[PDB]
Amino acid sequence: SPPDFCCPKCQYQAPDMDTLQIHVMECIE
Numbered sequence: 001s002p003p004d005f006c007c008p009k010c011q012y013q014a015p016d017m018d019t020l021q022i023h024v025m026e027c028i029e
């Protein structure tokens with residue numbers, strides 16, 4: 001099961017899908 005909870009900005013590992021989206025939404029300055 002290829003990990004899909006990875007951020008395309010810093011490869012950050014998210015515990016879920018929602019939190020992950022929130023991370024990327026601001027991961028960009």
Ligand SMILES: [Zn+2]
Pocket residue numbers: 007008009010011012023024027
């Ligand atoms: Zn990120």
